[PDB]
RNA sequence: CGAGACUCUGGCAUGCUAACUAGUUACGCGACCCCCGAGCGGUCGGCGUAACUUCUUAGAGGGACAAGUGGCGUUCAGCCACCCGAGAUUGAGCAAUAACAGGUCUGUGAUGCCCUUAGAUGUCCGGGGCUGCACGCGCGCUACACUGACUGGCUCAGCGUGUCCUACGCCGGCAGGCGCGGGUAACCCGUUGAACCCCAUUCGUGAUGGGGAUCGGGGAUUGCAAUUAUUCC
């Protein structure tokens, strides 16, 4: 089967990012991509929005793996 | 006909080192190194055959062993027989091949048409 | 003339301009240390030149 | 212009190898033993090990002057820069080159194959060695290559 | 008042100079925390994180490194850090401190005071490597 | 507490010295910077708009470590892995001209001195600018 | 104290099986800061049970062809893998590692016995060191399979196997392969 | 990021269909004639953000990117980046694009075949042109 | 006369043993000013040849080597002594390349 | 005889012999920093004496012998395990007797016969061919991707060659040009600034930016000559 993710957010999909995602206990661009039908660049950048909002902590950042968490 | 934005007659009367800016890199590379004693001799003899024809007649063929000779614009309209290791091949120098070598108009090999394969 | 057409080929590069200094052969030369021997005559004369087979 | 020290000892190697093959291809049937190049920077003194020293000098030294005139004209180093010397290897049985050339001379003389091999093999053990073999291979009779082998004493084959 | 020893892995050779100092351990001019493959940072901290800072207090350590690769240079230093403090505690401090502190290191890793002799084997013909050979085909 | 270049995280030291040179404003930028690769072994043009500055910043850093580098040695410095098509890969050097006019621009800021011994070294003014950028990184790291 | 990665401790880590206890490393004096140690553990037999089992998970993760010498690549895959375990579970991930190892290595295996051309396996017993060796291999291999051609990371997909085996769940790869080798053996007996 | 509403999913440039949802430094490459390396230099002369997607842009950005693609020397794009450097009939430097490059490989093939050069026969025969061992490789597609 | 460098290059160390340790022996016997015999890196000339002169067999190779051992020894004296001792001690395969200043 | 013994290599030596064509340490001098409110400290492949051999190099000499302990042994040959130890089986070279009608007259001025020897099978020259292409079979290279690719940044070798290796300026987008210097070599290339690796950036499961074959245009070097693309951009 084909996997056609979105490239920019939808009104509903940006809500799932804002509301659901900061309560996962494990937030990662691969995970967000897997649960929301979103390409890796968009989901990788959306987590940088959610650091700017302060909604989400930061555990580790690397070339290939960046790991985020629910808020405390 | 036009070559590099230069018409037929303007090519024929163009200076020698002015051709060394219209050619490609191999020809300009070779022309800066200069033609040799063997090669002006062919170009000399190509003038005479083209000189001695009736105006309805193509010139008499001039046979040659020089395959890596540059087709200069002096040579246009000539009849040239080129040795492919075996046989001189009658090649009329059409005006559109004026940047190439002679030898790629006289084939060496025969085009292969297979039969059946043998034992092995 | 034949004065002109005899040794007319420029043999200062390529394989023609090098041969063995023992057996005149120009296949498989050892050009390394200014040796210029074929790979058999070097193997023949290797004790007298001084190349000891150790390793 | 000087030569690289890598390239120099190689060029000294091709000098002795060509000089020894020169004296092998010439002084073979005249009792030859060996080349001893002794590089004195005034004169490249070349000492010739041999057995018949009188049969390589010539007549009051005719050939020894011929030979040292060949070398100057060959390797280019000038006059008065080379001497020659004949010192006899009196232990001709110990030298394998002499005994493989004495056996070359007898086989070229049309003697028997076994006779000359036993003559040499008895000689060198009488000459004080501790072991020796003589192999002669090739045409001995007919259109078939055979191999003969005349072993006496001890023969180390492996190692340093 | 000064002791200079080496350590060594495959081809890397790191030489540490120690004198009566004030707790600086610099390798090749730059600090221990700055050396680039920081995925292996703790392997360079292991002579410190086992003996504590208090032993590296009256000692100044310069390390001079050449050769090897990245990993091989990391392990060549941690030899030479460790071997020097041991050799400093011999000549200038009593032997009982030397034994005490040598025993803490070796029980963590024997590598810290004696080096691997395993170095690269010679490749032989008929194959790409020291033991390996080319493919062959039958029939 | 006198900081140095060597006491600092180096790939942030370069990021600091780069943005220093845009704020200085005077640095000769060639007009081909919008156009070209850095070597033959690189696939594409570099991503950064201001790549000339950080490569200028990288170049002054290497001169501080060893003084005496030429244009060819800098072309060796940013060398890479030429992927030779389906033939196996090899080492290829950078470009001589980008390595030239970087050293030539920073010579214009009196940061780079041309040497007795051939190459280019770093002026004592240039040694001031690095160690002042080194303070700006060491402070923003150890106090934050 | 000697923390793995400077942040994970060893004294919490508790071994269940006495069968595996002497053949699974770090508890107390094996405790080392990094997996990367580079010692001669295959110099003679039964020396590779004394090396830390995080380094065992390392050396079996560089294992494939394109990755086949790159150890610092791998101790980075390990380091990011424990911190995904901790954020999904909260347990000391070394305990999750050991509980995933113990549940993974099979306990009876089949073995071909008989002449050539005859295929009649008989069940035999599984060695304790081999059950360690079989489990790590079955753990690392499951990280390749669900993460060879998708977006998920191998520092991530390792931590999804290494959790799903400490549950002994059916979702793990190393559990289905234990549920086959030890299923086939009890039809050979 | 965010949700633009003037986001064309489908671009129609030079009779070629460009996927609007791709990065624009790699959606120009969807036409013939343009690769990766030339498209970056086209967009930098256009001074358009490489970060942004191809559907995200206006019309005046798109048609001036077209204009810089059509007329590269005018916008100081050098002559060594060009598709067709010295065209033999006129000696004129250009960058040749999708329907044109399709039309102007036929012109080089109809040149060398009419002249009966060596390469012209090769393309007429279907064989290897750059002087290659045809004994062993290039097998598939025959009877 | 001052700063007399002597350079020795042989092929075997045993002849180079006897010579190089006799120069420094006789210079100090004549009460001179020497540097120690310093030892250059030994050159190793490697030529790898096939054994077969056919190309038939099991692709077996010969690893031939040549080694060159180079020594330096310095002096500070009027050079009347140098020509005396050195030109007598002639061992075949041992070369003396004495340069001054 | 072969095996072994042997030679070379490797591993160990803070012991010995030495070092201006190798260094370290110290002391001068300079540059630079934070400063304190002077410094000191530091980094200096920045350059000058002195101390000397840890590092470098290479010479001699030691070192390991199943030695020591515990078991097993027709208890002795030898084996196992372990302590001390750098090392408890380093990797090669050489390799008997006998053969094969294995391979090589296309390595030889090593060669026996036979053949050809001036409308030459000698030899030079010119042009071609060894590559040709429906198809089989072998050694290989690069890939099929995200443990990736790209773009920046950062930081490490060794055996080696060199009269052609090259440095350093300059003009070159780039292959390259021009000039000027070193090196017959531990003196110069060169501290041989290697690559994956490391750290950020970008891209997200699709024939994709993976993958580069095949094709069109140009540009430059080598050579007498690039046409049947030498190689390179
Ligand atoms: Zn020969």
PDB file of C-alpha atoms (C1' of nucleotides) in Angstrom, chain F residues 1-4 6 10-11 14-15 32 36 38 40 42-47 54-55 58 61-62 64-67 69-73 76-83 85-88 91 93-98 100-101 104 114 118-120 124 127-128 131-132, chain J residues 30-35 39-47 140-144 148-155 166-178 189-196 198-203 209-214 231-233:
ATOM      1  CA  UNK F   1      40.492  32.843  33.455  1.00  0.00           C
ATOM      2  CA  UNK F   2      42.168  33.912  30.245  1.00  0.00           C
ATOM      3  CA  UNK F   3      40.309  31.849  27.687  1.00  0.00           C
ATOM      4  CA  UNK F   4      41.832  30.671  24.422  1.00  0.00           C
ATOM      5  CA  UNK F   6      41.507  25.652  22.319  1.00  0.00           C
ATOM      6  CA  UNK F  10      35.186  24.354  18.293  1.00  0.00           C
ATOM      7  CA  UNK F  11      32.146  23.980  16.077  1.00  0.00           C
ATOM      8  CA  UNK F  14      33.282  28.766  14.255  1.00  0.00           C
ATOM      9  CA  UNK F  15      29.583  29.670  14.435  1.00  0.00           C
ATOM     10  CA  UNK F  32      30.098  33.975  -7.619  1.00  0.00           C
ATOM     11  CA  UNK F  36      29.193  27.599  -7.292  1.00  0.00           C
ATOM     12  CA  UNK F  38      33.215  24.184  -3.136  1.00  0.00           C
ATOM     13  CA  UNK F  40      34.522  18.680  -7.604  1.00  0.00           C
ATOM     14  CA  UNK F  42      30.704  17.889  -3.766  1.00  0.00           C
ATOM     15  CA  UNK F  43      27.316  17.117  -5.246  1.00  0.00           C
ATOM     16  CA  UNK F  44      25.581  20.469  -4.803  1.00  0.00           C
ATOM     17  CA  UNK F  45      26.174  24.045  -3.760  1.00  0.00           C
ATOM     18  CA  UNK F  46      26.408  24.456   0.025  1.00  0.00           C
ATOM     19  CA  UNK F  47      23.130  25.085   1.812  1.00  0.00           C
ATOM     20  CA  UNK F  54      31.899  30.427   8.218  1.00  0.00           C
ATOM     21  CA  UNK F  55      34.458  29.128   5.767  1.00  0.00           C
ATOM     22  CA  UNK F  58      37.086  28.108   9.719  1.00  0.00           C
ATOM     23  CA  UNK F  61      40.941  29.059  13.077  1.00  0.00           C
ATOM     24  CA  UNK F  62      43.225  26.593  11.280  1.00  0.00           C
ATOM     25  CA  UNK F  64      45.815  29.915  14.586  1.00  0.00           C
ATOM     26  CA  UNK F  65      46.491  26.235  15.237  1.00  0.00           C
ATOM     27  CA  UNK F  66      49.347  26.046  12.738  1.00  0.00           C
ATOM     28  CA  UNK F  67      50.617  29.183  11.065  1.00  0.00           C
ATOM     29  CA  UNK F  69      49.495  27.272   5.467  1.00  0.00           C
ATOM     30  CA  UNK F  70      49.268  27.967   1.753  1.00  0.00           C
ATOM     31  CA  UNK F  71      46.463  27.834  -0.751  1.00  0.00           C
ATOM     32  CA  UNK F  72      47.148  24.201  -1.600  1.00  0.00           C
ATOM     33  CA  UNK F  73      47.161  23.059   2.008  1.00  0.00           C
ATOM     34  CA  UNK F  76      43.780  19.749   1.238  1.00  0.00           C
ATOM     35  CA  UNK F  77      42.036  20.797   4.479  1.00  0.00           C
ATOM     36  CA  UNK F  78      38.503  20.788   3.144  1.00  0.00           C
ATOM     37  CA  UNK F  79      39.048  17.576   1.245  1.00  0.00           C
ATOM     38  CA  UNK F  80      36.471  14.893   0.865  1.00  0.00           C
ATOM     39  CA  UNK F  81      35.281  11.602  -0.551  1.00  0.00           C
ATOM     40  CA  UNK F  82      34.812  11.696  -4.303  1.00  0.00           C
ATOM     41  CA  UNK F  83      32.231   9.042  -5.113  1.00  0.00           C
ATOM     42  CA  UNK F  85      30.426   6.775  -9.997  1.00  0.00           C
ATOM     43  CA  UNK F  86      30.388   2.991 -10.124  1.00  0.00           C
ATOM     44  CA  UNK F  87      34.137   3.046  -9.794  1.00  0.00           C
ATOM     45  CA  UNK F  88      35.355   3.047  -6.184  1.00  0.00           C
ATOM     46  CA  UNK F  91      40.075  11.463  -1.920  1.00  0.00           C
ATOM     47  CA  UNK F  93      40.785  18.180  -2.705  1.00  0.00           C
ATOM     48  CA  UNK F  94      38.693  21.318  -2.381  1.00  0.00           C
ATOM     49  CA  UNK F  95      38.887  24.250  -4.779  1.00  0.00           C
ATOM     50  CA  UNK F  96      41.971  26.409  -5.056  1.00  0.00           C
ATOM     51  CA  UNK F  97      40.149  29.675  -5.780  1.00  0.00           C
ATOM     52  CA  UNK F  98      37.678  29.621  -2.896  1.00  0.00           C
ATOM     53  CA  UNK F 100      42.521  31.572  -2.329  1.00  0.00           C
ATOM     54  CA  UNK F 101      40.134  34.483  -2.012  1.00  0.00           C
ATOM     55  CA  UNK F 104      42.961  36.964   0.348  1.00  0.00           C
ATOM     56  CA  UNK F 114      51.875  36.497   4.519  1.00  0.00           C
ATOM     57  CA  UNK F 118      55.992  30.931   2.134  1.00  0.00           C
ATOM     58  CA  UNK F 119      52.449  30.579   3.422  1.00  0.00           C
ATOM     59  CA  UNK F 120      50.072  32.773   5.368  1.00  0.00           C
ATOM     60  CA  UNK F 124      48.579  39.627  16.292  1.00  0.00           C
ATOM     61  CA  UNK F 127      44.927  36.636  17.551  1.00  0.00           C
ATOM     62  CA  UNK F 128      43.069  39.310  19.524  1.00  0.00           C
ATOM     63  CA  UNK F 131      40.453  35.176  21.894  1.00  0.00           C
ATOM     64  CA  UNK F 132      37.756  37.836  22.228  1.00  0.00           C
TER      65      UNK F 132
ATOM     66  C1'   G J  30      57.862  37.721  21.461  1.00  0.00           C
ATOM     67  C1'   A J  31      52.320  37.450  20.318  1.00  0.00           C
ATOM     68  C1'   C J  32      47.616  36.930  22.663  1.00  0.00           C
ATOM     69  C1'   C J  33      43.793  36.509  26.713  1.00  0.00           C
ATOM     70  C1'   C J  34      41.163  37.260  31.445  1.00  0.00           C
ATOM     71  C1'   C J  35      42.387  40.160  34.456  1.00  0.00           C
ATOM     72  C1'   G J  39      51.327  40.234  37.758  1.00  0.00           C
ATOM     73  C1'   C J  40      50.712  35.166  38.044  1.00  0.00           C
ATOM     74  C1'   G J  41      48.350  31.985  34.965  1.00  0.00           C
ATOM     75  C1'   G J  42      47.535  29.619  30.759  1.00  0.00           C
ATOM     76  C1'   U J  43      47.864  28.525  24.950  1.00  0.00           C
ATOM     77  C1'   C J  44      51.622  29.048  21.037  1.00  0.00           C
ATOM     78  C1'   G J  45      53.578  22.932  14.534  1.00  0.00           C
ATOM     79  C1'   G J  46      56.209  31.241  17.167  1.00  0.00           C
ATOM     80  C1'   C J  47      62.017  30.830  17.178  1.00  0.00           C
ATOM     81  C1'   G J 140      35.245  -8.243  -9.681  1.00  0.00           C
ATOM     82  C1'   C J 141      33.073  -2.907  -8.761  1.00  0.00           C
ATOM     83  C1'   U J 142      28.788   0.035  -7.308  1.00  0.00           C
ATOM     84  C1'   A J 143      23.999  -0.378  -5.434  1.00  0.00           C
ATOM     85  C1'   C J 144      18.968  -1.672  -3.838  1.00  0.00           C
ATOM     86  C1'   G J 148      21.038   6.331   5.044  1.00  0.00           C
ATOM     87  C1'   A J 149      22.049  10.364   1.488  1.00  0.00           C
ATOM     88  C1'   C J 150      23.331  15.663   1.123  1.00  0.00           C
ATOM     89  C1'   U J 151      25.552  20.345   3.078  1.00  0.00           C
ATOM     90  C1'   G J 152      28.687  22.597   6.434  1.00  0.00           C
ATOM     91  C1'   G J 153      31.966  21.976  10.743  1.00  0.00           C
ATOM     92  C1'   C J 154      35.575  19.048  13.691  1.00  0.00           C
ATOM     93  C1'   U J 155      39.613  15.706  14.397  1.00  0.00           C
ATOM     94  C1'   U J 166      55.930  18.652  -5.160  1.00  0.00           C
ATOM     95  C1'   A J 167      55.460  23.422  -1.766  1.00  0.00           C
ATOM     96  C1'   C J 168      54.402  28.754  -2.083  1.00  0.00           C
ATOM     97  C1'   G J 169      52.196  33.080  -4.642  1.00  0.00           C
ATOM     98  C1'   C J 170      49.013  34.726  -9.088  1.00  0.00           C
ATOM     99  C1'   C J 171      44.988  34.153 -12.778  1.00  0.00           C
ATOM    100  C1'   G J 172      41.528  30.647 -13.095  1.00  0.00           C
ATOM    101  C1'   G J 173      33.796  28.561 -11.114  1.00  0.00           C
ATOM    102  C1'   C J 174      36.604  23.652 -12.412  1.00  0.00           C
ATOM    103  C1'   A J 175      39.821  20.046 -14.788  1.00  0.00           C
ATOM    104  C1'   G J 176      43.914  23.495 -15.445  1.00  0.00           C
ATOM    105  C1'   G J 177      47.336  27.705 -16.719  1.00  0.00           C
ATOM    106  C1'   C J 178      51.853  31.323 -15.184  1.00  0.00           C
ATOM    107  C1'   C J 189      56.707  17.387  -0.419  1.00  0.00           C
ATOM    108  C1'   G J 190      55.388  16.384   5.220  1.00  0.00           C
ATOM    109  C1'   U J 191      53.409  17.424  11.373  1.00  0.00           C
ATOM    110  C1'   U J 192      52.850  13.202   4.858  1.00  0.00           C
ATOM    111  C1'   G J 193      46.042  17.685   7.920  1.00  0.00           C
ATOM    112  C1'   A J 194      43.439  10.482   4.297  1.00  0.00           C
ATOM    113  C1'   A J 195      38.568   8.198   4.286  1.00  0.00           C
ATOM    114  C1'   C J 196      34.426   5.968   6.677  1.00  0.00           C
ATOM    115  C1'   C J 198      32.475  12.366  15.114  1.00  0.00           C
ATOM    116  C1'   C J 199      28.871  17.022  15.517  1.00  0.00           C
ATOM    117  C1'   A J 200      25.070  20.090  13.534  1.00  0.00           C
ATOM    118  C1'   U J 201      21.846  20.952   8.854  1.00  0.00           C
ATOM    119  C1'   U J 202      18.398  19.353   5.294  1.00  0.00           C
ATOM    120  C1'   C J 203      15.326  15.091   3.303  1.00  0.00           C
ATOM    121  C1'   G J 209      17.238  13.967  -3.569  1.00  0.00           C
ATOM    122  C1'   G J 210      18.566   6.156  -3.003  1.00  0.00           C
ATOM    123  C1'   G J 211      21.017   4.494  -7.489  1.00  0.00           C
ATOM    124  C1'   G J 212      24.098   5.869 -11.175  1.00  0.00           C
ATOM    125  C1'   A J 213      24.183   3.182 -16.126  1.00  0.00           C
ATOM    126  C1'   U J 214      23.200   5.263 -20.734  1.00  0.00           C
ATOM    127  C1'   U J 231      42.035  10.396 -18.963  1.00  0.00           C
ATOM    128  C1'   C J 232      39.740  14.670 -16.475  1.00  0.00           C
ATOM    129  C1'   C J 233      36.217  19.002 -15.516  1.00  0.00           C
TER     130        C J 233
END
